[PDB]
Curated annotation (Swiss-Prot):
Protein name: Troponin C, slow skeletal and cardiac muscles
Keyword Phosphoprotein in annotation: yes
Disease: Cardiomyopathy, dilated, 1Z: A disorder characterized by ventricular dilation and impaired systolic function, resulting in congestive heart failure and arrhythmia. Patients are at risk of premature death.
Name of the gene this protein is made from: TNNC1
Alphabetical UniProt keywords: Acetylation, Calcium, Cardiomyopathy, Disease variant, Metal-binding, Muscle protein, Phosphoprotein, Repeat
Domain EF-hand: 14-49, 50-84
GO CC terms: cardiac Troponin complex; cytosol; sarcomere; troponin complex
Effect upon mutating A6V: In CMH13; increases calcium sensitivity of the myofilaments
Family label: Belongs to the troponin C family.
Part of the full-length chain shown: 3 to 92 of 161
Taxonomy of the source species: Eukaryota, Metazoa, Chordata, Craniata, Vertebrata
Other remarks on this protein: Cardiac muscle Tn-C can bind 3 calcium ions per molecule. Domain I does not bind calcium.
Amino acid sequence: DIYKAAVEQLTEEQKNEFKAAFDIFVLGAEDGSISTKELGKVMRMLGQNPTPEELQEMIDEVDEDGSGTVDFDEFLVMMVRSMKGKFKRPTLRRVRISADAMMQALLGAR
Ligand SMILES: [Ca+2]
């Protein structure tokens, strides 16, 4: 359930971006979920030559409810699992601390 907590942290733009990708995977599917047939076609389009066992094990790992297919909610958990600003937030903090330290040196001067 720990991966489901980070799903709610995703922005509206990230969820819409992932939905667009998911839609390409399920374009050939009648039930709106990714089966080995859809996965195999996508894998072959990307230049891969997967075996049937490879396709089944890929689906099985991200398939939480044993349906043999991947739905959008399971797809989102899979995306969050692979995403496990190092520069931006701490740098903006250090720059603010520096500007504050300069203002403190000024106002605090005798
Ligand atoms: Ca499933």
